[PDB]
Symmetry: D4
Subunit: 162 residues, 8 copies
Amino acid sequence: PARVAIVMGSKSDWATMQFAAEIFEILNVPHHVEVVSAHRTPDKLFSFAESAEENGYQVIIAGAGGAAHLPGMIAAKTLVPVLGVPVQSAALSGVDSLYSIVQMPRGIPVGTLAIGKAGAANAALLAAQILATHDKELHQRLNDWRKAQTDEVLENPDPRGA
Amino acid sequence: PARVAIVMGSKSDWATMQFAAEIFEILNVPHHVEVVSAHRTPDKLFSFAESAEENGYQVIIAGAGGAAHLPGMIAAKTLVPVLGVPVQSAALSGVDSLYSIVQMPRGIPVGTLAIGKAGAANAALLAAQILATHDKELHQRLNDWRKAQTDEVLENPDPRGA
Amino acid sequence: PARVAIVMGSKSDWATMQFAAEIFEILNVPHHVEVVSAHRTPDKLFSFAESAEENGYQVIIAGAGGAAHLPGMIAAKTLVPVLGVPVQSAALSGVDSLYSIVQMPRGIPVGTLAIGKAGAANAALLAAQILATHDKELHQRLNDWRKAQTDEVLENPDPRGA
Amino acid sequence: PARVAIVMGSKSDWATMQFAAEIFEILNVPHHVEVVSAHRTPDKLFSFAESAEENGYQVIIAGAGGAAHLPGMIAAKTLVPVLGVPVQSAALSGVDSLYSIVQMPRGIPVGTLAIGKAGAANAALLAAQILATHDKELHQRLNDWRKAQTDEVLENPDPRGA
Amino acid sequence: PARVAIVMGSKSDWATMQFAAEIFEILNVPHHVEVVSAHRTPDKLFSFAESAEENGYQVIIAGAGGAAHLPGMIAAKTLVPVLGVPVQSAALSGVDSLYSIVQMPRGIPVGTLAIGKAGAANAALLAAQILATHDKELHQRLNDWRKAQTDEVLENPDPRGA
Amino acid sequence: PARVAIVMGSKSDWATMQFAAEIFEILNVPHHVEVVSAHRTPDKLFSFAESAEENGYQVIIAGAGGAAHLPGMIAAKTLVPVLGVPVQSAALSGVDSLYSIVQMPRGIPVGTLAIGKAGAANAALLAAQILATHDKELHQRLNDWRKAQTDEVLENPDPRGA
Amino acid sequence: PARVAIVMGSKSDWATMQFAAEIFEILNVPHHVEVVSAHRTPDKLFSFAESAEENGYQVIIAGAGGAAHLPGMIAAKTLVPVLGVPVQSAALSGVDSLYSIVQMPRGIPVGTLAIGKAGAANAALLAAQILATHDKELHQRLNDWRKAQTDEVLENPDPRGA
Amino acid sequence: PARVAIVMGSKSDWATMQFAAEIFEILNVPHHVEVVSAHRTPDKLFSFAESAEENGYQVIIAGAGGAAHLPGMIAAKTLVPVLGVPVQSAALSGVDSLYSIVQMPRGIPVGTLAIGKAGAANAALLAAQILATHDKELHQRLNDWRKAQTDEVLENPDPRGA
């Protein structure tokens, strides 16, 4: 059963959000992926958020750029935790995306990650850490993955040419 | 019949939006005022936008601060022209408000005005200019008001003490 | 009869503003296009704005970059509604364009759209929505166009490879 | 048993973080509060993070301003989910706090909330939503609290004087 | 004969521009002061700039805030050198004023000074230096004034209490 | 006799400053060009500024990027008018260059132009306008050049393909 | 013998730089304090930097705001290590001060500290750490001071009221 | 004996930090180079900083990008002077790197250099200047290197083609 859903405002956002799905493939975490536009499919946004709890989602990762309203509007319609990923926009390099997501008012939170691909991957890792609190097997896989990243850096201390 | 509606995300926004209503009092333009929160009353936002055309509104002026989603979400749900006013936020001085409103994607526009009270007043003036295209009497009142502002500056060229 | 005029500060601005004209071709809205420079042809700017109402324009879309004075100076010379499009500048990525257009003082409004091509397209859509208030046929075409955009997203929910 | 810990870099941060504790008092959520400085008590930071899981914490809310390293360094030392609150700094108004917290690299996430008191309150609400996934009673209290906020706005639509 | 004119967009700008006039009083430089609004008195702006050379002005100092179009539009209408002073705006602290003035395109220059009162004083000093090139007496007064400022700093090297 | 000197911090700045020299070639204005580094040749900077008046310079155009100290330090050492051109830096896109030049304190002015090549060309035009005040022939050439730029825009009003 | 010199651009900078002197009083480090203006006393700046090594200075702490040229120009004239403190400016809140100091080009470094009073204190601490490398007694005093700061935080973990 | 250590958060940082090592090769200064990640190898960071004094390091140059915590966390764990180099990040062009490093609180300083390669080279030059205070031979080599840079600019005053 998919306990996490990855949503984005447009198909072009996949170039960024694919990095969230990559973490789940590595950690073997079942997940749903779907394009839900706050501005082009506002009604679908409402129906998606309203049925999130019933559909079994415990965490929702939402990505959007520019006037990024997707994460916040989903968070306004459900109690399921929402994590937001600011997609890098052309002109403002994601600052508009960042401000539109992180500056939510008291009462409707959205846990925001870094701008771009690093944030997409981290949103998945955070979702995994949340799930891992009640999933011993996943907790172990996260632990092993973290150790693997640390060891790679430790066994290669000199960045200069051989 | 009220052809324009002034909406805002919170009652504290009235300190800013009251300047939009002031322009309408001066120009004798019937208007509706209401608090519609994108995050605290998402369902009311949808019902307000869906019935805007039927309620007779030809222009909607929406004000919000921070992660200002109100103008854009209304614009996504109706063909009635939407004008957005960025309320000045504490930490980011309205830059977050500005970015969240003006950076709308292709297909769902929001005509954005200046940050703060100047923008609120201008949103009302712009709405009035739009209405004035098919209202000769209002067009005349706008003309007289503009002349009055120009004359005040012209009859007082020296800013120094008397 | 052309009820909307698209003006820009330089011919190089056409790479951006062509997206406004594209919306009008799609919606079958007669329009005028012309290069009017606030700094290189200041007198032409004044004559263009002064005769706008008599020439039948109900909405004026003006695009400019850098110290973008074109939209505001036109708005200062006519009661015809003015929509401004900030062209993306090299060094400041359109922030200078945005500030010079959106920050107009009380009394002379300019409805501002997003930086770049998205804003150009949206300025045309907003102008169309304004016209649609008194044009049932255009209102229907806008409605059908919006439905077409929504349906495209709805019939393609999975962004991943086939 | 306290399932959430609220930590901050300095005692002066309490003026902001007290709003996180307020949400927990309202929702009846047991919590721990402590000053842990990344720069003045680096060793305590490591010991706090290392024992977080054993101490029963399922969510950690960390607040800091300026070169805000506290949230990220805790996240680097534990798998327990970390939420970060950017405290508003004097000179940069929290932009430095925001960048130092949200821009974490791939592998070590920190779910970031808004700058200031709104973010502190939201970090607590997000932590509550996370806990609510496996706590039916808390889920109900969150639901009732949200309804109460919505109703207050709905029963007071006119912001003007009586 | 007044060889320099100090103009500003509004009477409220005098709180800033008075510092330009102060330099001229100190240096005994005849000057004209007047409120010329680019947006409220566009026609007066054109007539002022067109007659500047005939009126004997060799330098024009123009101050404005927000969407500061005054300096640039004057520069577009005359060959008399124009110096611009960005007035500090509330929300954007003069960054909008600065961008709207300094970013002029190739062909129409505006020599820009610092944001606020320091810039107003410096615009007058720069105008004085320009005049001083062909005015030996003024050149001497500028020299003596500069020496006086240097000496004050030199005779007070210790900033601590006596 | 060269009445204007064009100086820059490094030879790589020539890619930008060459546009200032281009204006002088077009207008037939004798000029000096030289690399004077505030940081690599501080003593040469002082000797250049000290002898500027004696060498016949009436205007000095100085270009620099990053921590752009060149214009201001020259202005601190001479009464000859100094115009500054902010060169576009890689990381901050000239904002650091702009701030380091335009924000000069009361007493030592630097007339600042736009970031990059547009500013370089404009600094030369401004210098020319300053000289033109006492040079009827140059004033005429500037007039003809401006007319030529205006006419080019006027005879090509339609930006679309033929 | 004073091994460190604290210099600033103006006497008003003392409100900030006094915090650097405070650290030296606490640590018992002999120091010189003087007002040296890059723009008002350029010649004094050169003589101060040229004689720094001969006067026994091993570290120079320089503070300035706005177009902060003082630190960099001193660094260009001496091999004695220079530390820069950005004073908080009114309009740009020290961002101009920060950029003008930190962005020095290859060859002439300035170790930059935080904006404002925190940076002033830290510049003194850094200077002390540099001296401490060859001064066992000072190294011990720095150690004891750091322990004292850590202990204060450790003995007061609960920020709430008693 | 290596008196300086160059550390960085990731191997990809070497493209920037190699310019620090280049200065040391030119000046013949023994140095250590190593990858120490604040987020991926937090324990190694602590052990590296704790043993820095015993390992003979008198200056530590640390480079990092994004949420750049490396320099500050090292500085919190040792009295050895720490110099920080902000690596240029993709989205924010090093502004996040700069803020996370320079804004350190009172008590734990980090001398910060420019964003990118210029800063890396300057951090090495500053470290060299610090060492040169007690190393006459190195002081001479630094002097000769500086003279060489100055002479290159002096013998090539004309940037134009031959």
